[PDB]
Amino acid sequence: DPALRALQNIRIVLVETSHTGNMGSVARAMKTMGLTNLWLVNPLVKPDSQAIALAAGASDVIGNAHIVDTLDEALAGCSLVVGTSARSRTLPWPMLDPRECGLKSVAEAANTPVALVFGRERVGLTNEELQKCHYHVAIAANPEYSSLNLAMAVQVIAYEVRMAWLATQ
C-alpha cells in the first residue's frame, strides 16, 4: 500500500469491546483502508478464533494489536485524540464529522501519532474517557436511527482517513 507510511501513525483504539467478532470486523475495516495500528483497551475477552475469523485477510492487524489495561496507555505519545460522541449542549466539546476527522488526522499524522478512539458496543465512551479527547466525532445520521454499529463507525471513519490521504496524492 502506498499509504502504509502516511497512515501507520493513526491508531484505532477500541475501548472495552464486548464482542470479539467486532474486533475482527474492525481489523478488516481498517486494513481495507490502509490502517494497520489497532489498540484494545481492557477488552472483555482477548481476541479469539471468532475475532480472527471476522478479520479474514486482516488477521495480522489482530495479531499485531496492542492490548493495554488503560486508555491513558493507548493515548501516550499522541498529539491528537478524537473520540466518537454526539454533540453536547451542556458540556460542549469541539466537533468533527468523519470527513473533517479524516482531513485533520492525516494532516497531524504527517508529524506525530493520532488516536481515533471508539467506545463500547451500545454504551460508547464514558465521560471520563471523552474528556481525554481533543475533539469528538459525530457521524450525521437518520435522526430516527442514529447509532452506527461499532465496526461500521470504524469503517466510515477509516474510509474518510483514506480519502483525506488520497487527496494529498
Add this chain to the structure above:
Amino acid sequence: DPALRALQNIRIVLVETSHTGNMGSVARAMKTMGLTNLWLVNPLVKPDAGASDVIGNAHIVDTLDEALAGCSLVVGTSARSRTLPWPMLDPRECGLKSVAEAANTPVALVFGRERVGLTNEELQKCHYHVAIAANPEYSSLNLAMAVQVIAYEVRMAWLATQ
C-alpha cells in the same frame, strides 16, 4: 428523517446474498443513513434489529432486470477493469450523482455476492461502476461495509443540499 423523501428513490439492490446476517447488517447500515428501499435479487434463502422494517418491506425479485426497471441511473460495485472497461465513479461522486438523480427518478445501487461480486453480464446492466478506493494489498470490503460506505456518501451528498 428529513432525508426520507429525497432518498426514497434510491434502491439498494443485493444480488444473491448468501448470508442472512449480512442482509440484517445491510438493513441497519441503510437505515442509519436514511435509505429504506431494499431489493433482494434471488437471495440464496429468504430473510429469516431496529431496521427490521427495511427487511420486512424488501422487494424480493428473481431477476436483476426487475430491480433495475424504471431506474434512470444504475451504479454497480466493481473495481476498474482493463479488459471490460466501464465508466468509473468513486463513492463520493456516486453519492452526488445518486442524490441529484433521485430527486426526480429511481436510482439503483447494486452490490454483488459475498467475496466474488457481480458477473460481467450483471455489470453490463449498469451505467457506471463504483470502486471504493482501498489498500491494494487488501481491497475487498465486507458486503455490509461496502453498503455502509456508499450509503454514507449518499447521506453526505443529501446533507449538502441543506
